[PDB]
Design a protein around this ligand. Structure first.
Ligand SMILES: CCCCCCCCCCCCCCCCCC(=O)OC[C@H](CO[C@@H]1O[C@H](CO[C@H]2O[C@H](CO)[C@H](O)[C@H](O)[C@H]2O)[C@H](O)[C@H](O)[C@H]1O)OC(=O)CCCCCCCCCCCCCCCCC
Ligand SMILES: CCCCCCCCCCCCCCCCCC(=O)OC[C@H](CO[C@@H]1O[C@H](CO[C@H]2O[C@H](CO)[C@H](O)[C@H](O)[C@H]2O)[C@H](O)[C@H](O)[C@H]1O)OC(=O)CCCCCCCCCCCCCCCCC
Ligand code: CLA
Ligand code: CLA
Ligand code: CLA
Ligand code: CLA
Ligand code: CLA
Ligand SMILES: CCCCCCCCCCCCCCCCCC(=O)OC[C@H](CO[C@@H]1O[C@H](CO)[C@H](O)[C@H](O)[C@H]1O)OC(=O)CCCCCCCCCCCCCCCCC
Ligand SMILES: CC1=C(/C=C/C(C)=C/C=C/C(C)=C/C=C/C=C(C)/C=C/C=C(C)/C=C/C2=C(C)CCCC2(C)C)C(C)(C)CCC1
Ligand SMILES: CC1=C(/C=C/C(C)=C/C=C/C(C)=C/C=C/C=C(C)/C=C/C=C(C)/C=C/C2=C(C)CCCC2(C)C)C(C)(C)CCC1
Ligand SMILES: CC1=C(/C=C/C(C)=C/C=C\C(C)=C\C=C\C=C(C)\C=C\C=C(C)\C=C\C2=C(C)CCCC2(C)C)C(C)(C)CCC1
Lengths: 31, 76, 156, 61, 120, 34, 33, 135, 34, 92, 450, 54, 37
């Protein structure tokens, strides 16, 4: 819950998934 | 304790992840699709590099009056 | 301006489709037929193609090629007499490069095919004997080639 | 018609590809199942010959 | 880094913008004249390298806008004329025989009336 | 310049022959486990 | 309760799909000349 | 955006113009890059740099080739810069399509689209069509 | 104008990829000489 | 040389020197490039603009196309470093 | 399971195919399976290339590498190098794809269900890696097969349709090679000459007669050597020089295959007789010579006297002399004066280029060829842009010559690394110290101090 | 000369003579040690390295 | 193009050449199945 390991792994894996979704959305933008 | 080889097997981990991860992925997709990023970060859209009046590259040319200069260059 | 969603096109099947940059279109963005999904051009023999096949220009070009090739072939005996083999080998490939194309384009009947094959064999033998430096065989092959090409043009 | 023949050939080949290694690896299965595999091989060769003959007839002038 | 190139860029862009207002101020377009407040401020801030001249330009611009907020068609014209006379603002169009306003992109004269290019 | 060519050829063939016939003299048996 | 040779297969499938999507986008859309 | 003001090009010698459809632009770019691009990439001529494809060079040619009709006519019957001799045997054309097999499947719409692409490029890129490596 | 080419390619590659793990899993279930 | 007086007559102006200019200088006069300019740039020095009409082999057409633009021509002293490169001067 | 784990064999999983060294039944199946994979790839690739064909472009603008071999063999090609039909390519692909299935079934059977070792029930197909007679017998058999293959190629060249000759008298076309050369001096002077510039070693074969004669000699030599190695046993000077084990034989083969890969890559880069230029595109030197030819023709047509023109250095802008006297093209292409091409030979005399022929006997087709070859030079980038490294994205072209050369050169170097590794390990294992140094009897400790 | 196609670069008798002399001299030195080898079927071995003396 | 009768199969031909890479990966999958003996 408040252990150091959980806060770490999470605080570096949530933005990764958010950004990956963002890039996948970017892949279909048309000029 | 309980090293990773045990987490990658427990079913509660699987159910909480299957309910949590797609929400974040869809949130990122919607963040890009709705056009909010262009507003948050100021990135020009593919049809906003040159306006009808300005046909040149808009380089900032002042230090202490950057706000007014950027406001004029953006739309005005 | 203030807020606008960017244009989307998924593989050309879910979206606009024609956005000046799509890729993987294979057609389906133009009102015309293509040779294949991997091609940009249309069918060659289609009804609206500007190029015919066998019009007057082609026939005139081939016949001019044949006539000038006969005129060029009439020089080999002098080269063989002077023992200038490089001239013999160069004459058969300088202007006469299009002779095979013209002959194969103007031959339809089987006897024309036989004449063309005989003429090609004769000139090949002439070139071989020129590069082997044998005067008699080269002269005989040159005479045979002249006669065969004259016969083929007469049969036209 | 040869399109249907080619489709049948493709399906038979897919079945053979899925089936044969499984029979070979398991002990004893190849010993017992060695009568219908001959039938499938004969059907494969016959389909090949039929496709070749039909294509040759269709395209030869 | 402030230098002569910064002054050249600011002078070009904002002086052209200000000189474009001559016809508008001749008859009177108070709203359209006030629409170039940012241009006036930018020209005052980044096109004059002199403390006294900058102060005078700020005073003149303040007078111009004070006349604007009065429906005063005469004081506005007089202040605009004296600003133009002091700061040497005029519309400039170039040719190609004696030209070459720009060569590449990134220039503030790429697609303007000042931009002429001679290709050998 | 021909004499230089002759001398160089002699030297090269001498050393190359030394190499070739040295490797043919039961080389694999020259190990500390003989 | 999945043995540790199927989960890796799923992860590999996801990674391959993501990489193929980005190498395709290189070939189409924005930034494709 | 690619408006209709920027898609207006001159068609004939009198001065009449037209509006190119968005599909014609794509077809013209594709066909040009497929057929011309080996020798006419970027608006220049590789095997004879004296005769370019920029608007100024097209305007100072004899039969004047700064419009769609003249470009189509040139594609159907090429000539030299002064319009005196025919060069159909050393340049691709419909007349010599028996020599160049890449021109045997072209219709009138294809030529129209290619000419439209050539005419449209200067209004978009400007001074980079036929400019060379300096730009 | 529905672009059957892309759907065909995707379906074909998916089936071809799935062909292998299927036989491996079948052998595992049937207790073969893996 | 460091200083060359007649530098404006090499193609950068409206007047072309008949004795030193490259063949590209005639590309801005319509109807003259591939036929008449090639004959002009491959013949000996001219003491006057009127001497260009004595070139052995000029057909009529070249004569009137030259007559049309005669007002844009001049003939100066021959500089050997410029006259040797009149067909190809390395500019592309 | 015994024989398939580290406990019973060593050789952990990432080195598992090394457990088949002394198992002669599964090794046969493995080699047969790789052969089936090769055949399958050949058939699939040629079918894929056939499916994407368009008749407007030439073969070297479509990124093909397999269709050109069939075209050179004389299938579906016309005068001048124009493709007229693709059905034979389809037939070849179908045949290869069908044969791959039989090969694969044989491999999987001999690997999974057949006997583990063949030395007890099939003495004919059995060996020990140390019985020199059996190894020589196998070598001779497969050598005789190679010789038969070479003779088959000769038979195809002489009777079964012919091959495409690019030096044909009257434009490149298919013809019968009726009088191949057989004088051993010519063939073995091709073999025994220098590899440097002007010589070219075996890459410099420049006509079809020498090609046919060489493959004839190769067939004869292979048959004779196969019979000889079948009926004999290694002599004394060979017994005491080699190491007799499987890994040693593998290393011996690896070295030769690396050399062959290097030679093939240089064939692809330099030769234009077995690799006609209308199917693979121009070579390196050919494009530069074409550029020089094109600008020579243009400047001469403008009215210039292209024999007396002086370049910036004072050396000659279009024509000059080679360091041995021959008249050649000028410019930076003075390094490529050894080129010989079918579109430039008609203008050559006994001492180089002929001035009289150049002045007033140049044909439009040579001009067309030079213009085409100048703009399709073998230059490009990894993402297939084409042109010089400072070009913009408009063209999509990389020549097949560059692909073939680079790929097979890379493979040759890595197989040389294979020679080194596998041979060193083989000899160390044969001596008996591949597992490390013995603590009790360290060899260095019993040596005189240095 | 330079671009000619002689075998091993041999353009004179002396070059061939010196090549022969070199190979033959080293060959005779090697023969002085290995010239008594026989092909009878008892000098062979069954192993990976020939340890059978000479 | 393929001959007119077989044009329907071109999606399969577009994927045929890449199979040996799948064989190479299948080797690793098989090894992982037995848990790297
Ligand atoms: C064997 C000796 C190995 C040492 C090689 C060094 C020199 C290799 C070299 O200059 O090789 C080049 C020659 C190619 O010869 C070229 O051959 C050409 C032959 O073409 C001629 O003939 C053709 C036939 O149509 C065309 O007509 C063409 O126009 C015409 O010029 C010309 O003669 C060129 O002048 C000549 O350079 O290749 C060869 O001899 C054949 C290749 C030999 C094997 C390649 C050697 C291994 C690679 C080098 C080592 C790699 C080291 C790194 C490894 C780690
Ligand atoms: C792990 C890293 C490797 C993965 C690479 C990503 C795979 C997909 C991207 C790729 O590959 O690239 C994408 C291409 C598919 O892209 C197509 O690639 C084409 C490549 O051009 C080819 O086609 C063009 C016209 O078709 C021109 O003819 C051009 O000359 C010719 O090369 C064009 O770019 C097409 O527009 C584009 O759609 O896939 C390919 O090439 C398919 C073939 C890939 C395997 C080829 C084997 C590798 C080549 C042998 C090794 C060469 C060694 C070099 C030295 C080392
Ligand atoms: C119904 C009878 C029939 C007919 C009319 C044809 C007709 C044809 N076959 Mg064919 N074929 C048949 C039955 C038939 N086949 C059968 C039963 C088989 C075995 C299954 C084959 C196997 C076969 C192969 C493997 C090939 C042909 C090919 C051909 C074509 C060229 C033949 C050729 O060059 O002669 C052969 C010439 C000589 C023997 C001497 C010259 C031709 C259209 C060829 C083809 O299509 O190439 C594109 C080809 O490669 N055939
Ligand atoms: C005919 C060729 C040939 C053959 C039959 C062998 C045979 C052998 N080698 Mg050898 N080798 C060769 C060529 C060859 N080698 C070459 C050219 C090299 C130089 C690179 C080596 C380097 C080498 C080393 C360093 C070792 C061997 C070993 C072995 C033995 C076990 C090999 C094994 O289990 O592989 C197992 C196979 C794998 C684990 C697969 C690895 C996957 C590779 C690295 C991928 C390569 C990238 C590929 C090209 C592209 C990937 C695309 C992908 C993204 C889809 C076996 C006797 C080993 C041994 O024990 O010797 C006694 C050993 O240690 N070899
Ligand atoms: C060309 C590639 C190739 C080939 C032919 C082989 C062949 C072989 N390997 Mg090997 N190997 C390879 C690559 C290859 N390997 C690589 C890259 C690695 C590194 C990961 C290994 C690692 C390895 C190890 C660690 C071991 C082998 C072993 C073996 C042997 C027995 C395999 C076995 O028991 O099957 C068991 C496997 C199965 C039953 C599952 C496969 C089922 C089939 C064959 C899959 C293919 C079917 C096909 C798609 C359908 C076609 C059907 C046809 C009718 C069309 C066999 C000779 C073993 C050995 O030495 O045996 C003595 C062993 O211990 N290999
Ligand atoms: C170079 C390839 C090669 C080699 C050397 C062998 C060698 C062998 N095979 Mg094999 N095989 C191969 C390819 C090969 N095969 C292929 C491609 C297939 C698929 C068609 C088969 C299918 C096959 C079967 C089905 C059988 C063999 C059998 C045999 C063995 C006995 C053969 C015999 O008595 O013939 C003697 C011939 C002349 C003296 C022998 C070890 C047999 C065996 O060992 O069974 C116990 C057996 O039943 N093979
Ligand atoms: C793939 C080709 C190949 C390979 C690997 C071998 C391998 C071998 N040959 Mg051989 N040979 C071959 C083709 C081949 N041969 C051909 C085609 C001929 C005919 C010209 C000969 C004629 C030949 C003779 C005359 C002799 C060998 C000998 C040898 C052995 C020693 C080679 C050496 O020291 O160097 C070795 C087993 C020598 C040997 O040991 O004799 C048994 C020997 O005296 N070979
Ligand atoms: C395989 C290796 C087998 C040999 C083991 C020995 C390795 C020793 C290392 C050899 C290096 C020393 C070689 C120098 C030779 C040299 O430079 O020659 C230099 C000579 C060139 O010689 C020059 O030739 C010119 C021709 O106009 C002129 O005549 C020059 O005067 C003359 O110097 O080149 C050769 O002799 C090359 C011949 C060898 C190529 C054919 C090899 C035959 C077998 C082919 C199989 C292997 C491939
Ligand atoms: C042993 C082993 C291995 C290997 C394996 C192998 C290598 C295999 C092979 C396999 C193979 C090698 C296979 C093949 C197959 C083939 C087939 C199956 C074919 C088929 C064909 C068809 C079906 C065709 C059809 C058609 C026609 C006829 C016409 C046209 C169209 C088409 C094309 C469709 C591994 C490593 C994995 C692992 C370990 C063990
Ligand atoms: C086909 C052809 C041809 C060819 C022919 C021929 C005839 C070839 C041959 C070839 C050959 C004929 C080759 C050979 C080679 C050899 C080799 C390659 C050898 C090597 C050696 C070795 C390897 C050894 C080593 C060693 C030493 C030295 C020391 C000791 C140890 C040992 C023994 C190891 C030609 C070109 C004409 C043309 C085209 C076609
Ligand atoms: C021809 C033909 C065909 C085909 C056949 C074949 C021959 C196929 C099979 C084969 C196949 C095609 C197979 C595949 C499989 C593969 C896979 C799918 C793989 C995957 C992989 C992975 C993903 C891996 C991963 C991993 C792991 C697991 C662990 C360790 C690490 C790693 C990462 C490596 C058919 C039937 C259509 C019919 C027609 C004809």
């Amino acid at each position: 819950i408040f252990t150091f390991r959980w806060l770490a792994v999470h605080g570096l894996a949530i933005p990764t998934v958010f950004f990956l979704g963002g890039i996948t959305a970017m892949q279909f933008i048309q000029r | 304790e309980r090293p990773f080889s045990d987490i990658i097997t427990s079913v509660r981990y699987w159910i909480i992840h299957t309910i949590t991860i797609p929400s974040l992925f869809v949130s990122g997709w919607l963040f890009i699709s709705t056009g909010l990023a262009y507003d948050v970060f100021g990135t020009p859209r593919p049809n906003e590099y040159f306006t009808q009046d300005r046909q040149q590259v808009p380089l900032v040319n002042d230090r202490f009056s950057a706000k007014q200069e950027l406001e004029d260059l953006t739309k005005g | 301006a203030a807020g606008e969603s960017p244009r989307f096109s998924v593989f050309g099947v879910i979206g606009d489709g024609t956005s000046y940059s799509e890729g993987a279109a294979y057609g389906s963005d133009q009102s015309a037929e293509t040779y294949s999904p991997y091609s940009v051009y249309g069918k060659v023999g289609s009804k609206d193609a500007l190029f015919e096949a066998g019009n007057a220009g082609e026939i005139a070009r081939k016949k001019g090629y044949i006539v000038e090739s006969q005129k060029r072939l009439k020089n080999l005996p002098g080269y063989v007499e002077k023992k200038q083999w490089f001239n013999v080998k160069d004459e058969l490939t300088r202007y006469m490069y299009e002779t095979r194309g013209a002959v194969r384009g103007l031959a339809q009947t089987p006897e024309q095919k036989k004449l063309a094959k005989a003429f090609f064999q004769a000139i090949e033998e002439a070139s071989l004997q020129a590069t082997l430096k044998n005067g008699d065989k080269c002269a005989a092959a040159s005479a045979d080639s002249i006669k065969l090409l004259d016969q083929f043009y007469a049969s036209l | 018609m040869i399109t249907a023949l080619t489709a049948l050939f493709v399906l038979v080949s897919l079945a053979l590809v899925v089936t044969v290694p499984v029979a070979l690896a398991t002990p004893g299965e190849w010993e017992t199942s060695k009568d219908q595999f001959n039938k499938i091989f004969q059907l494969w060769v016959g389909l090949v010959v039929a496709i070749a003959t039909a294509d040759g007839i269709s395209t030869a002038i | 880094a402030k230098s002569a190139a910064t002054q050249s860029r600011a002078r070009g862009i904002y002086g052209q913008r200000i000189a474009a207002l001559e016809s508008a101020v001749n008859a009177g377009d108070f709203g359209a004249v006030a629409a170039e407040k940012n241009a006036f401020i930018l020209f005052n801030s980044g096109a004059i390298a002199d403390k006294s001249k900058k102060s005078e330009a700020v005073k003149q611009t303040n007078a111009i806008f004070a006349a604007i907020r009065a429906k005063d068609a005469g004081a506005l014209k007089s202040a605009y004329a004296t600003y133009k006379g002091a700061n040497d603002i005029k519309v400039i169009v170039a040719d190609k025989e004696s030209g070459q306003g720009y060569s590449n992109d990134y220039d503030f004269k790429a697609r303007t009336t000042l931009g002429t290019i001679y290709v050998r | 310049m021909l004499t230089l060519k002759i001398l160089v050829y002699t030297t090269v063939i001498f050393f190359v022959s030394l190499f070739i016939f040295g490797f043919l003299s039961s080389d694999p048996s020259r190990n500390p486990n003989r | 309760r999945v043995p540790l040779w199927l989960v890796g297969l799923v992860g590999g499938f996801a990674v391959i799909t993501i990489v193929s999507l980005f190498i395709y986008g290189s070939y189409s859309g924005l930034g494709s000349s | 955006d690619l408006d209709e003001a920027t898609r207006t090009v001159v068609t004939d010698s009198s001065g009449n113009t037209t509006v190119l459809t968005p599909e014609q632009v794509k077809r013209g770019k594709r066909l040009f890059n497929a057929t011309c691009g080996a020798c006419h990439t970027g608006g220049i001529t590789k095997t004879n740099p004296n005769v370019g494809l920029d608007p100024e060079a097209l305007s100072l040619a004899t039969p004047r080739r700064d419009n769609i009709s003249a470009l189509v006519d040139y594609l159907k019957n090429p000539t030299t810069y002064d319009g005196l001799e025919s060069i159909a045997e050393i340049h691709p054309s419909i007349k010599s399509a028996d020599i160049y097999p890449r021109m045997r499947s072209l219709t009138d719409e294809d030529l129209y689209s290619i000419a439209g692409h050539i005419m449209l490029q200067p209004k978009i890129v400007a001074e980079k069509w036929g400019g060379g490596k300096i730009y | 104008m529905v672009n059957w080419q892309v759907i065909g390619q995707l379906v074909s590659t998916g089936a071809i990829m799935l062909l292998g793990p299927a036989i491996i899993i079948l052998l595992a279930l049937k207790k073969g000489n893996l | 040389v460091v200083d060359y007086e007649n530098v404006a007559l090499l193609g950068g102006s409206q007047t072309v020197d008949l004795n030193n200019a490259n063949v590209r200088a005639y590309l801005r006069m319509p109807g003259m490039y591939p036929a008449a300019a090639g004959k002009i740039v491959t013949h000996g020095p001219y003491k006057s603009v009127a001497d260009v009409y004595n070139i052995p082999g000029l057909t009529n057409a070249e004569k009137e196309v030259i007559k049309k633009y005669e007002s844009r021509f001049t003939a100066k002293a021959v500089a050997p470093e410029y006259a040797i490169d009149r067909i190809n001067n390395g500019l592309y | 399971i015994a024989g398939r784990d580290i406990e019973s064999t060593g050789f952990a999983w990432w080195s598992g195919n090394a457990r088949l060294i002394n198992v002669s039944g599964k090794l046969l199946g493995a080699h047969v399976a790789h052969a089936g994979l090769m055949v399958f790839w050949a058939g699939a690739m040629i079918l894929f290339e056939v499916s994407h064909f368009v008749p407007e472009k030439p073969l070297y603008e479509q990124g093909f590498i397999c269709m050109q071999h069939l075209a050179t063999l004389g299938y579906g090609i016309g005068p001048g190098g124009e493709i007229t039909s693709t059905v034979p390519y389809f037939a070849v692909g179908v045949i290869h794809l069908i044969s791959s299935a039989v090969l694969g079934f044989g491999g999987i059977y001999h690997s999974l269900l057949g006997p583990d070792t063949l030395e007890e029930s099939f003495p004919f197909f059995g060996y020990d890696w140390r019985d020199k007679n059996k190894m020589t017998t196998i070598l001779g058999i497969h050598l005789c097969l190679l010789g038969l293959g070479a003779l088959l190629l000769v038979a195809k060249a002489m009777y079964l349709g012919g091959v495409y000759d690019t030096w044909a008298p009257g434009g490149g076309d298919v013809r019968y090679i009726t009088t191949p050369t057989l004088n051993p001096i010519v063939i073995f002077g091709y073999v025994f000459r220098s590899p440097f510039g002007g010589d070219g070693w075996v890459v410099s074969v420049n006509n079809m007669e020498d090609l046919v004669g060489g493959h004839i000699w190769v067939g004869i030599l292979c048959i004779v050597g196969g019979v000889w190695h079948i009926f004999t046993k290694p002599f004394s000077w060979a017994r005491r020089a080699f190491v007799w084990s499987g890994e040693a034989y593998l290393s011996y083969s690896l070295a030769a295959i690396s050399l062959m890969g290097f030679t093939a890559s240089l064939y692809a880069w330099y030769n234009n007789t077995a690799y006609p230029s209308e199917l693979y595109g121009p070579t390196g030197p050919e494009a530069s010579q074409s550029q020089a030819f094109t600008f020579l023709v243009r400047d001469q047509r403008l009215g210039a006297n292209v024999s007396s023109a002086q370049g910036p250095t004072g050396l000659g802008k279009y024509l000059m002399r080679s360091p041995s006297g021959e008249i050649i093209f000028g410019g930076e292409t003075m390094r490529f004066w050894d080129l010989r091409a079918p579109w430039v030979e008609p203008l050559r005399g006994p001492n180089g280029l002929d001035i009289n022929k150049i002045k007033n006997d140049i044909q439009p087709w040579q001009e067309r060829r030079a213009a085409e070859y100048m703009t399709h030079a073998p230059l490009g980038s990894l993402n297939s842009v084409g042109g010089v490294a400072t070009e913009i994205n408009s063209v999509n072209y990389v020549s097949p010559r560059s692909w073939l050369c680079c790929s097979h050169f890379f493979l040759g170097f890595f197989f040389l690394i294979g020679h080194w590794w596998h041979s060193g390990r083989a000899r160390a294992a044969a001596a008996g110290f591949e597992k490390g140094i013995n603590r009790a009897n360290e060899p260095v400790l019993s040596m005189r101090p240095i | 000369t330079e671009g000619t196609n002689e075998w091993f670069g041999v353009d004179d008798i002396r070059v061939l003579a010196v090549l022969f002399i070199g190979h033959y001299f080293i060959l005779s030195l090697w023969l002085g040690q290995y010239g008594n080898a026989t092909e009878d079927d008892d000098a062979d071995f069954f192993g990976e390295i020939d340890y059978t003396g000479s | 193009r393929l001959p007119e009768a077989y044009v329907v199969f071109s999606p399969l031909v577009d994927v045929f050449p890449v199979i040996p890479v799948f064989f190479l990966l299948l080797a690793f999958v098989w090894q992982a199945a037995v848990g790297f003996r």
